[PDB]
Ligand binder design. Structure first.
Ligand SMILES: *[C@@H]1O[C@H](CO[C@@H]2O[C@@H](C)[C@@H](O)[C@@H](O)[C@@H]2O)[C@@H](O[C@@H]2O[C@H](CO)[C@@H](O[C@@H]3O[C@H](CO)[C@@H](O)[C@H](O)[C@@H]3O)[C@H](O)[C@H]2NC(C)=O)[C@H](O)[C@H]1NC(C)=O
Ligand SMILES: *[C@@H]1O[C@H](CO)[C@@H](O[C@@H]2O[C@H](CO)[C@@H](O[C@@H]3O[C@H](CO)[C@@H](O)[C@H](O)[C@@H]3O)[C@H](O)[C@H]2NC(C)=O)[C@H](O)[C@H]1NC(C)=O
Ligand SMILES: *[C@@H]1O[C@H](CO)[C@@H](O[C@@H]2O[C@H](CO)[C@@H](O)[C@H](O)[C@H]2NC(C)=O)[C@H](O)[C@H]1NC(C)=O
Ligand SMILES: *[C@@H]1O[C@H](CO)[C@@H](O[C@@H]2O[C@H](CO)[C@@H](O)[C@H](O)[C@H]2NC(C)=O)[C@H](O)[C@H]1NC(C)=O
Ligand SMILES: *[C@@H]1O[C@H](CO)[C@@H](O[C@@H]2O[C@H](CO)[C@@H](O)[C@H](O)[C@H]2NC(C)=O)[C@H](O)[C@H]1NC(C)=O
Ligand SMILES: *[C@@H]1O[C@H](CO)[C@@H](O)[C@H](O)[C@H]1NC(C)=O
Lengths: 142, 905
C-alpha cells in the first residue's frame, strides 16, 4: 500500500467492433500504450519502486476495417479495467501493492512470471482484451 | 493455290527488322472517322528470292508516296527495288506487293509503304478505347495485336515463327503519350510534322512475333517504378484512379512475383520494361503480349474499401499468370497457336505457386483442386469434350486461334502440370524448365523439347527413379479427355480402372489408342499408415497386396488428389471408412475428406453408389469444420434444392440440413468472436461466408437475427457501409426477401446512385430476392427502359429474377411476352442470350413445365432466338432429364430422400 515513490501511466486504446448480433465486443490489436523505458518502448520497468498505475481508455470503433477512426457509439462504448487471475494476487490495480522486487511490463510472454489481465467492461459482457506480461517478488519493494 | 491465299506466310520472307511510322488520328475528322495513316518500312531478307512479296496486312488501303504506293530504298550493300503495286486478297486479307523485277536473294530490301486505315472501336487491330472521366469522354489509341489483329494495325509478316526487331516512330497528339513494347529510343518531337503531332522514336525490340509487339497512345497517368534488376514496372491508370490509389496494391504485388519466377526459370527477364495497363474495358481482361500487358480495370485494380477478399485473390492470380507468360512462350517463342493450351496450362499452375509466394498464409495450392481440377471435372465428364492436345494443322483460321483459348485448355493443363511435378518430385521439373529456357531462348519451340529437358534432368539424378519415361506418362493424359475411376476391394487388394462420365448413359464418339486406360500414380494410406508409392500400369485390372486389408484396417487412395482421377472402394471398406470418419477425421487428410464427399455424390449421379451412401458422407460433416469438405457438399446439394424446392421433400430436407449446419455455425461464431474477427486465411474466410448463407437459407433462427441487425445498421447512414464486403451480398438478399416494398425501393435507389460497378452489381442481385409478386413484375418492366437499366446489365437482372422461386413463373411469362424486343437487342451481337435461356429451366422438373417450353419455342420460332437458339435446345434437354429421372430413379429418390431425412431429424 505504501509507495516509496509515486512519480507515467499506461493508456489502453480500446478497439471495439460490433458483433452484428448487436453485442459490443472487444477486438484484437487494442493497444496498451507502453512508454519508452530508456531504450525500449515495449517493456517499462519503473525506476520508481512503487507505481501509480492509472488506467485510461480510449474507445475506437471499426465498421470492419482495420482503421479505428470511427468513434465509439452507443453499445460499443467501453472502459478497460485490469484485474488478474494469473498473478497470485488479484491485483485489480489497487493502491495496495503486493510484494515485487522488480516490476516490469513486458509485452513478451517469455521471461515473465505472471500476466496482468486488462478487461474491457461492456454492459453486455466483460472481455479481457490483453494480458500484460509482468516479470514478477521481494521484501525490499512493497 | 497462291502463297497469299494460304494463311501461312511464306518462309522465304523473313523480317530482319521493322521500322514503323504511324500516325493515329485521335481527333474526329470531318467524316468523323478516326484514321491511322502511316508509312512503314519493311526491312527483310529473302531466303529464296521472290518477285511477289506477301505481307500480312488486314483491311488497309495504301496511300501512294509520290509515284508508287511502295517506295523502296536500299543503302550500301542492302538493295531495294521500288514495288509497282499493292493488292489485298479478299479471302485472306493479306497485303501482297507485286514487283515485276526479280528479287535479289538474301539481300536487305527496305519497303516503305504509306497506308491508310480507319480506327474503329471493335477491340481489334488499331482501335479506340473510351473512358468517361469527370463527365468527359476520353479518346485513347489502343492496339489489339493478338493473331490477325496485328495485321490490321500495321503491315507485318505476322506469324509466331516470324520474328522481327521493331523500331517504332509514333506520331500522336501531344497531350496523349505513346507507349510501345520497348523503351523510347528518342523523345517525342513537339513540332516535327506539326505542333500538334508528337513523334516518339522507340528502341528496336528484342526479336519477337509481331503479335507480341503492341503500341498504345493513352491519357493515363503514370507513377514510374524501377526494380533493383532495373526492369521498369508500374501502371497506366486514369488520373482520378491514381489519386484513389487503387493500383498501388497491384504494384506492390508484381515485384516479388517477378523475382520468384526469375529464380525458378533461372533466367532474368530480358525486357527492361514491363508495363501493366488498366484498360477501361478489355474484352479479354488480360494480355499475353510481351513487354506490354493490358488488363481490364477490374482485374488490375483492387479497392480496399469496397472490394471483397475474392477480388484481392483475383488481382494477384491474374498478374502472376501474365508474368509467367513473359518468360514462357514469349522469351522461348511458342511455335504456333496450337501449343497455346500448354502455355496457358503451364502459366496457371505456375501462377498458383507465385501467388503462394506472394501470400504465404493463403494455401493457394490447396485451393487449386477446387478451382481448376473440379471445374474441368464437370466438363471432361461430358462425353462431348475435346481432347486436350491440339494439332498445328488443325489451327489455321483466326477463329481457330480463338477456339484454342478455352477453359479446358487452362484449367486441365494446370492439373496435368501438378501431376507431372509430383512424379518428377519438383526439383527435376524445375531443372528441366530452366535448362529448356536457356537452350531454346528466342527459338520457336514445342512441348517435346521441354519434356526432353525434364527427362534429361531426371536422367542426371539417380535418387528419384521413374518406371516410365516422362514423355510417355504425360502423353496418355494430354492426348485423351477425361479421367478414370479406380475401384479397390479391400478383401483381395484388386484394383480396377474405367472412364467416368457423369451422365449414366452417354456415348463417347471420340476415339483414343489408350482407350481410357492410363498409367496412374497411386499414393496410398492403410489404416493411417503411408504405403510405398505404386505406379499403376495402364491395364484394367491388377492385384496388389498392400491395398488388401484385414478386419479393422481400411485403405485410402489418391492422397491429396494429385492425380487426375476418381476413386471408389468396396462397400465394406466404404462403411469402414465412414465409421472411421465419424470416430476420427484426423487420420484422413483434408483434401481426401473433401474428395470422399465429392466422389460419392458424383458416383451417385451416375448411380454407381446408392443415394443413401452419398447422404452418409454428409453425416460426418457435423464433425467437420474445414472449408474444402463443406464446399464440396454444398455444391452437390444445389441440384437437390432445385429439384425438391416445390416438392413435399423440402421440409424434411431442411431439418436434416439444419442439424448438420448448426455445429459449424456455432463453431464459426465462437472462432470469429460472434462474426467480427474474420479469419485471415483465405480458405477460412470463404467458409465463414458459406456458414452464414446456408444457415439463413435453412432454419437457424440465430442467422436471421444477425442478418436483420446488419441491414438495419446499413439503412441508417447508408453512404458508409457497415457490412463486411465478403458478407455484403448475403445480408442484402435475405433482408429483401424478409422485407416489404420499402426494402426494395431503398435498394433500387442505391443501385442507380452507385458509381462503382461492383457495388451496383451487388445491389442488382438483391432486388430480385423480394417475395411479393407485384414487386417482381414492376422490376421486370424496369429492365426494358434504357435509363433504368443498362443493356449489358439487363441480361443479368433477368437471370436473378428467375432464381427467386416466386419469381420463376413471372420471369418466364415476361420473357415470352417481351421476347422480340430483347432478342433484337441481345440475340444479335451474342450478349449472353444463351446464358439467359440457361437461367430459366433451372428449376423445371415437371411435365407441365416442359409443355410450356415447347409452346414458346413454336410461337417465337418465326421471330428467332438469335444466340439463344442452341441454348433453348439444351434447356429443354435439361428439363427432360429431371423429369426422366422421376420416371426411372427420382420417384424413388424423392421417397428415399424423405425417409432418410426423416430418420436423420
Ligand atoms: C455470441 O452470441 C451468442 C448467441 O447470442 C444469440 O444471439 C443474440 C442476438 C442474442 O439474442 C442472444 O441472446 C442469443 O442467444 C451469445 O450467447 C448468448 O449469451 C446471452 C447473453 O448472456 C445469453 O442470454 C442469457 O440467457 C440466459 C438463460 O439462461 C438468461 O438467464 C440471461 O438473462 C441472458 O438473457 C444466451 O443464453 C446465450 N446463447 C447461447 C446460444 O448460449 C454469446 O454471449 C455471444 N458471445 C460474445 C462474444 O458476446
Ligand atoms: C493499434 O496499433 C496497430 C498498429 O500496431 C493498428 O493496426 C494498424 O491499423 C492501421 C490503420 O488501419 C493499418 O493501416 C492500414 O494499412 C492498410 C494497408 O496495409 C490500408 O489498406 C488501410 O487503409 C490502413 O491504412 C495498419 O496496417 C494496421 N497494422 C496492423 C498491425 O495490422 C491498430 O488499428 C491499432 N488499434 C487501435 C485500438 O487503435
Ligand atoms: C542432364 O540434364 C541436362 C539438362 O537438360 C542435359 O543437358 C542437355 O544435353 C542435351 C543432349 O543430351 C542437349 O541437347 C541440351 O542442350 C543439354 N542442355 C543443357 C544446356 O544443359 C543432359 O543430357 C542431362 N544428362 C543426362 C545424364 O541425362
Ligand atoms: C497434402 O496437403 C496438405 C495440406 O497442404 C499438406 O500439409 C502440409 O505439409 C507441409 C509439409 O509437408 C507443411 O509445411 C504444411 O504446414 C502443411 N499444410 C497444412 C495446412 O497442413 C500435406 O503434406 C500434403 N500431403 C501429401 C500426401 O503430400
Ligand atoms: C448408410 O449408413 C446407414 C446407417 O448410418 C447404413 O445402414 C446400415 O446398414 C448396415 C449394413 O448395410 C446395417 O448393418 C445397419 O443395421 C444399418 N443401420 C441402420 C440404422 O439402418 C446404410 O447401409 C449406409 N448406406 C450404404 C448404401 O452403405
Ligand atoms: C471522431 O470524432 C473526432 C472528433 O470530433 C473526429 O475528428 C473524427 O473525424 C471522428 N471519427 C469518425 C470518422 O467518426
Amino acid at each position: 500500500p505504501s509507495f516509496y515513490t509515486h512519480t507515467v501511466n499506461i493508456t489502453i486504446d480500446l478497439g471495439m467492433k460490433r458483433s452484428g448480433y448487436g453485442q459490443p465486443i472487444a477486438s484484437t490489436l487494442s493497444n496498451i500504450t507502453l512508454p519508452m523505458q530508456d531504450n525500449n518502448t515495449d517493456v517499462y520497468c519503473i525506476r520508481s519502486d512503487q507505481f501509480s498505475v492509472y488506467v485510461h481508455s480510449t474507445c475506437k470503433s471499426s465498421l470492419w476495417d482495420n482503421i479505428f477512426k470511427r468513434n465509439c457509439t452507443d453499445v460499443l462504448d467501453a472502459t478497460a479495467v485490469i484485474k488478474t487471475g494469473t498473478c497470485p494476487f488479484s491485483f485489480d490495480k489497487l493502491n495496495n501493492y503486493l510484494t515485487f522486487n522488480k516490476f516490469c511490463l513486458s509485452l513478451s510472454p517469455v521471461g515473465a512470471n505472471c500476466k496482468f489481465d486488462v478487461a474491457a467492461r461492456t454492459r453486455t459482457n466483460e472481455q479481457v482484451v490483453r494480458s500484460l506480461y509482468v516479470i514478477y517478488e521481494g521484501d525490499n519493494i512493497v | 493455290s497462291k502463297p497469299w491465299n494460304h494463311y501461312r506466310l511464306p518462309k522465304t520472307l523473313i523480317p530482319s527488322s521493322y521500322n514503323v511510322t504511324l500516325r493515329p488520328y485521335l481527333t474526329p475528322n470531318s467524316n468523323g472517322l478516326y484514321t491511322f495513316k502511316g508509312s512503314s518500312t519493311v526491312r527483310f531478307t529473302c531466303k529464296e528470292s521472290t518477285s511477289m512479296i506477301i505481307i500480312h496486312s488486314k483491311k488497309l488501303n495504301y496511300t501512294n508516296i509520290q509515284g508508287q504506293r511502295v517506295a523502296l530504298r536500299g543503302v550500301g550493300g542492302s538493295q531495294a527495288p521500288a514495288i509497282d503495286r499493292t493488292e489485298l486478297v479478299e479471302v485472306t486479307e493479306y497485303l501482297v506487293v507485286h514487283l515485276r523485277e526479280p528479287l535479289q536473294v538474301n539481300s536487305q530490301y527496305e519497303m516503305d509503304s504509306k497506308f491508310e486505315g480507319e480506327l474503329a472501336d471493335d477491340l481489334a487491330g488499331f482501335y479506340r478505347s473510351e473512358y468517361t472521366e469527370n463527365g468527359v469522354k476520353k479518346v485513347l489509341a489502343t492496339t489489339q495485336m493478338q493473331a490477325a489483329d496485328a495485321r490490321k494495325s500495321f503491315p507485318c509478316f505476322d506469324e509466331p515463327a516470324m520474328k522481327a526487331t521493331f523500331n517504332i516512330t509514333l506520331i500522336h497528339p501531344s497531350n496523349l503519350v505513346a507507349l510501345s513494347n520497348m523503351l523510347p529510343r528518342g523523345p517525342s518531337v513537339p513540332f516535327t510534322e506539326e505542333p500538334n503531332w508528337n513523334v516518339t522514336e522507340f528502341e528496336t525490340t528484342p526479336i519477337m512475333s509481331t503479335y507480341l509487339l503492341a503500341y498504345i497512345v493513352s491519357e493515363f497517368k503514370n507513377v514510374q517504378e524501377n526494380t533493383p534488376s532495373n526492369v521498369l514496372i508500374r501502371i497506366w491508370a486514369r488520373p482520378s484512379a491514381m489519386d484513389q490509389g487503387h493500383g498501388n496494391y497491384a504494384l506492390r504485388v508484381t515485384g516479388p512475383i517477378l523475382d520468384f519466377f526469375s529464380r525458378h526459370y533461372d533466367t532474368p527477364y530480358p525486357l527492361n520494361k514491363s508495363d501493366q495497363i488498366a484498360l477501361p474495358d478489355f474484352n479479354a481482361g488480360a494480355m499475353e503480349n510481351w513487354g506490354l500487358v493490358t488488363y481490364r480495370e477490374s482485374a488490375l485494380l483492387y479497392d480496399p474499401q469496397s472490394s471483397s477478399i475474392g477480388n484481392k485473390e483475383r488481382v494477384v492470380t491474374v498478374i502472376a499468370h501474365e508474368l509467367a507468360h513473359q518468360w514462357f512462350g514469349n522469351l522461348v517463342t511458342l511455335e504456333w497457336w496450337n501449343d497455346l493450351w500448354l502455355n496457358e496450362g503451364f502459366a496457371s499452375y505456375v501462377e498458383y505457386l507465385g501467388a503462394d509466394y506472394a501470400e504465404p498464409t493463403w494455401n493457394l495450392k490447396d485451393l487449386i483442386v477446387l478451382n481448376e481440377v473440379y471445374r474441368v471435372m464437370a466438363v471432361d465428364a461430358l462425353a462431348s469434350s475435346h481432347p486436350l492436345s491440339s494439332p498445328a494443322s488443325e489451327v489455321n483460321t483466326p477463329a481457330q486461334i480463338s477456339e484454342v483459348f478455352d477453359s479446358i485448355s487452362y484449367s486441365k493443363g494446370a492439373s496435368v502440370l501438378r501431376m507431372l511435378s509430383s512424379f518428377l518430385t519438383e526439383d527435376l521439373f524445375k531443372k528441366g524448365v530452366a535448362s529448356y529456357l536457356h537452350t531454346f531462348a528466342y527459338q520457336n519451340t514445342i512441348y517435346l523439347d521441354l519434356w526432353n529437358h525434364l527427362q534429361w534432368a531426371l536422367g542426371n539424378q539417380t535418387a528419384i527413379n521413374l518406371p516410365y519415361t516422362v514423355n510417355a506418362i504425360m502423353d496418355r493424359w494430354i492426348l485423351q479427355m477425361g479421367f478414370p475411376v479406380v475401384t479397390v476391394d479391400t478383401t483381395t487388394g484388386t484394383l480396377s480402372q474405367k472412364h467416368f462420365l457423369l451422365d449414366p448413359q452417354s456415348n463417347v464418339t471420340r476415339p483414343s489408342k489408350f482407350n481410357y486406360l492410363w498409367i496412374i500414380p497411386i499414393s496410398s494410406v492403410k489404416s493411417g499408415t503411408q504405403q510405398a508409392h505404386y505406379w499403376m500400369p495402364d491395364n484394367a485390372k491388377v492385384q496388389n497386396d498392400l491395398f488388401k486389408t484385414t478386419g479393422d484396417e481400411w485403405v485410402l487412395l489418391n492422397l491429396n488428389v494429385t492425380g487426375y482421377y476418381l476413386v471408389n472402394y468396396d462397400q465394406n471398406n466404404w462403411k469402414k471408412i465412414h465409421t472411421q470418419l465419424q470416430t476420427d477425421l484426423s487420420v484422413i487428410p483434408v483434401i481426401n475428406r473433401a474428395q470422399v464427399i465429392h466422389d460419392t455424390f458424383d458416383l451417385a449421379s451416375a448411380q454407381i453408389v446408392p443415394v443413401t451412401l452419398a447422404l452418409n458422407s454428409t453425416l460426418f460433416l457435423n464433425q467437420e469444420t474445414e472449408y474444402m469438405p463443406w464446399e464440396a457438399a454444398l455444391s452437390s446439394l444445389s441440384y437437390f434444392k432445385l429439384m425438391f424446392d416445390r416438392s413435399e421433400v423440402y421440409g424434411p430436407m431442411k431439418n436434416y440440413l439444419r442439424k448438420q449446419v448448426t455445429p459449424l455455425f456455432n463453431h464459426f461464431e465462437k472462432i470469429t468472436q460472434n462474426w467480427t474477427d474474420h479469419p485471415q486465411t483465405l480458405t477460412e474466410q470463404y467458409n465463414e461466408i458459406n456458414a452464414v448463407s446456408t444457415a439463413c437459407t435453412y432454419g437457424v433462427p440465430k442467422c436471421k437475427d444477425l442478418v436483420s441487425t446488419l441491414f438495419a445498421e446499413w439503412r441508417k447512414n447508408p453512404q458508409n457501409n457497415p457490412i463486411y464486403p465478403n458478407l455484403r451480398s448475403t445480408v442484402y438478399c435475405n433482408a429483401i426477401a424478409q422485407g416489404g416494398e420499402e426494402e426494395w425501393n431503398f435498394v433500387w435507389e442505391q443501385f442507380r446512385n452507385t458509381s462503382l460497378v461492383n457495388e451496383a452489381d451487388k445491389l442488382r442481385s438483391a432486388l430480385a430476392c423480394s417475395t411479393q409478386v407485384w414487386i417482381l413484375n414492376r422490376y421486370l418492366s424496369y429492365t426494358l427502359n434504357p435509363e433504368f437499366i443498362r443493356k449489358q446489365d439487363v441480361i443479368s437482372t433477368l437471370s436473378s429474377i428467375a432464381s427467386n422461386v416466386i419469381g420463376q413463373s413471372l420471369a418466364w411469362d415476361f420473357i415470352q411476352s417481351n421476347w422480340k424486343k430483347l432478342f433484337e437487342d441481345y440475340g444479335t451481337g451474342s450478349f449472353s442470350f444463351s446464358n439467359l435461356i440457361q437461367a430459366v429451366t433451372r428449376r423445371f422438373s415437371t411435365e407441365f413445365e416442359l409443355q410450356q417450353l415447347e409452346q414458346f419455342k413454336a410461337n417465337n420460332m418465326d421471330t428467332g432466338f438469335g444466340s439463344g437458339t442452341r441454348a433453348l435446345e439444351q434447356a429443354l434437354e435439361k428439363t427432360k432429364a429431371n423429369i426422366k429421372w422421376v420416371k426411372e430413379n427420382k420417384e424413388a429418390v424423392l421417397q428415399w430422400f424423405r425417409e432418410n431425412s426423416q430418420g436423420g431429424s
